[PDB]
UniProtKB/Swiss-Prot annotation, chains A, B:
Binding locations of L-aspartate: 37, 133, 186, 377
Family, similarity comment: Belongs to the class-I pyridoxal-phosphate-dependent aminotransferase family.
Keyword terms of this UniProt record: Aminotransferase, Cytoplasm, Pyridoxal phosphate, Transferase
Source organism of this protein record: Escherichia coli (strain K12)
Induction description: Transcription is increased specifically in response to 2,4,6-trinitrotoluene (TNT) and its indicator compounds 1,3-DNB, 2,4-DNT, and 2,6-DNT.
UniProt cross-references to InterPro entries, sorted A to Z: Aminotransferase_I/II_large, Asp_trans, NHTrfase_class1_PyrdxlP-BS, PyrdxlP-dep_Trfase, PyrdxlP-dep_Trfase_major, PyrdxlP-dep_Trfase_small
Gene Ontology terms: cellular component: cytoplasm; cytosol
BP GO annotations: L-phenylalanine biosynthetic process; L-phenylalanine biosynthetic process from chorismate via phenylpyruvate
Localisation: Cytoplasm
Assembly description: Homodimer.
Name of protein: Aspartate aminotransferase
């Protein structure tokens, strides 16, 4: 008998995670990693946060069992998540209109939402910004949903093309899903203003879209509450919406897989009925979620002393990134760059489109050992005072 | 505009995991939970293993980052898994014919296999035993695969109906998947003898089946090496197979979601090509796996001192369950049962497949506060010297 595996074609490498493999194998001591969206401190390391180490020590000494969690995970984790998203005292919470499942990362929350939609509703299409995180299309396609693109970025002016966005979204039908990044758009770092969020919200209710927010960077633009203003404007108007959030980055808990999928419906009866099918889709995927990382998050957010430490550590990360953006722009001019790079200062989060071509990005890797994503996305949080000069010298050399 | 969630039909509660909610709600003193397949010690608790606590302390002291794992997880965890399944010195390992991905539990391993098969192969059908773990059908159906049932249990003699198993797999075609439980069949506790495994291995290769082993209880039947004899008989004859394994039960790590999906192909070039598509399926689901639980397992298995402690803790679990099986049968007799329950002594693993009707299971719950699965599956590892007498008085009353 001829093998079931014999004719499988090899998959292409992941445009983000495959870069990490290349970078690890590179033997040059001066190599610089500006690819995957992981925070680095001023020393070039990705430490465990102190708030997280303290919570892990508490868990080690007080955990008495590893018995399965419920399908939807730790109850306090879900309550804390809804407060962060919608704010204490939200009507969504007091009206009992939201349900939250703890999930393995924000990616797991996206896939659970996608599986839930494909198997229990009439949804067929998901609209995603052009550009967006490369894995969005793969997640939704693998659940059986079609992915469509709406305009977003003006590469000439390095801004949000708001007229193009609205014009292209006038093709999205009632009952389509439209995906928004909550803040720190990946990869452009360009977010709507509050006014623009409010225009999109009113339009959304008018056209009958089902909003789906990918919220992986709460706290990295302006602040925890400020970064949720856009979501909270949608939540004020809509009967229905979905939020896939991640604690990977704002808690530095990447590899423990901590995220949440939050369902909102018009009333308590409908959301409980829908959440019953969300739980069924989870059960047929990974059964129930991993406890360690989510237990850490719930411990930190439940304890005023740990939460105050964590909030300061998040502010420090946010502010260090802002300092590197300015240093990056200033150092490019000193190293001989002709172009104006000041638009970098206007972008939020870890990421920015550098304006570099695929050929230039390739040269940076092969000739200078500087690793960026082929789209020209660079991770500013991977820049340090010590690697800024060689990094900038390399960019000027390929311009 | 009509809501997207209005037309949703509620899902029923899980036949196993829903029991926890029903049991927690029950206010009657002395209620007994014989439902979900977790181990309990002599005091009715599910403690963290000492070997696990020691490993967690080492990780707390030595972890310096939570940076993402690769898509397939901790390399050392994969190597230790293959040695455990196939044996040190296995030709499958020496010839590099196996690749392993760390997954979120055994369930996650089954789902990754299902998504991989549906996307990349001509597999259309999966054969599972009647009875089986109820979530098998849900996992494979979630990828759009047809699930058929083969005969397995002789409810009259409380044995394996080997003639009917053979006859009922007659219509399983080349390229169909046939799912086998590695040991401690869930729910029956009846496993093939070595002679029966060898017969099935030869038949499988003559008919061209793709075997898939679900290995959730290695070490709970007779021992770690002994429980793998059937898989190793298959592995000696087959070019291709898949193993989904779990460390939830034999390490007591249920809620940290520690499992593995192992792919075996004819040669290194083929398995690497197929594995690249399995990694693609993981990336579009939960991206990469949770570190904490798998790090514990890898630490324990790669340290001779910790591994010896763990192997003794697993022996202690196995022996307590065997003692309770015998006490259960003796006490049923003491309490006046006229039905012969001696077949329970011949079953393996955490459970006894008692033959009680759905009607009798509902009556135990509602009238005596004793909780079993509606198939009549009872968790022997939930029995203690303190609850055995009332448990048996209740069963005798509904007979
Ligand atoms: C990081 C990221 C994710 C994935 O989050 P994980 O928790 O690592 O799975 C999803 N969407 C966006 C935009 C991200 O930046
Ligand atoms: C427990 C069990 C599983 C699931 O294991 P998890 O690690 O909890 O996902 C799968 N198959 C069988 C037969 C089981 O008994």
């Amino acid at each position: 008998h001829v093998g079931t595996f014999e004719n499988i074609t090899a998959a292409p490498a992941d445009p983000i995670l495959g870069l990490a493999d290349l970078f690890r194998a590179d033997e040059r001591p001066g190599k610089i990693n500006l690819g995957i969206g992981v925070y680095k401190d001023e020393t070039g390391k990705t430490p465990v946060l102190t708030s997280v180490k303290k919570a892990e020590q508490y868990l080690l000494e007080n955990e008495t069992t590893k018995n399965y969690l419920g399908i939807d995970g730790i109850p306090e984790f879900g309550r804390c998540t809804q407060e962060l998203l919608f704010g204490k005292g939200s009507a969504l919470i007091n009206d009992k209109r939201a349900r939250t499942a703890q999930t393995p990362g924000g990616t797991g929350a996206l896939r659970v939402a996608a599986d839930f939609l494909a198997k229990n509703t009439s949804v067929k299409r998901v609209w995603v910004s052009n550009p967006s995180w490369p894995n969005h299309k793969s997640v939704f396609n693998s659940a059986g949903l079609e992915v469509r693109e709406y305009a977003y970025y003006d590469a000439e002016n390095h801004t949000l093309d708001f007229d193009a966005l609205i014009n292209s979204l006038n093709e999205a039908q009632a009952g389509d899903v439209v995906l928004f990044h909550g803040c720190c758009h990946n990869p452009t770092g360009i977010d709507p203003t509050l006014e623009q969020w409010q225009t999109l919200a009113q339009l959304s209710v008018e056209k009958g879209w089902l909003p789906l927010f990918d919220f992986a960077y709460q706290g990295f633009a302006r602040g925890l509450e400020e970064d949720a203003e856009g979501l909270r404007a949608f939540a004020a108007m809509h009967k229905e919406l979905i939020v896939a959030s991640s604690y990977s980055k704002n808690f530095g808990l990447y590899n423990e897989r901590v995220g949440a999928c939050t369902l909102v419906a018009a009333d308590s009866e409908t959301v409980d009925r829908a959440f019953s099918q969300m739980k069924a889709a989870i059960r047929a995927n990974y059964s129930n979620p991993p406890a360690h990382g989510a237990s850490v998050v719930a411990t930190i957010l439940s304890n005023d002393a740990l939460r105050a430490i964590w909030e300061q550590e998040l502010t420090d990360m946010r502010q260090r990134i802002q300092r590197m953006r300015q240093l990056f722009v200033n150092t490019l001019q000193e190293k001989g760059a002709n172009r104006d790079f000041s638009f970098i200062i206007k972008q939020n989060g870890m990421f920015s489109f550098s304006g570099l071509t695929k050929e230039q990005v390739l040269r940076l890797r092969e000739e200078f050992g500087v690793y960026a994503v082929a789209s020209g996305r660079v991770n500013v949080a991977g820049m340090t005072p010590d690697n800024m000069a060689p990094l900038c010298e390399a960019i000027v050399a390929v311009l």
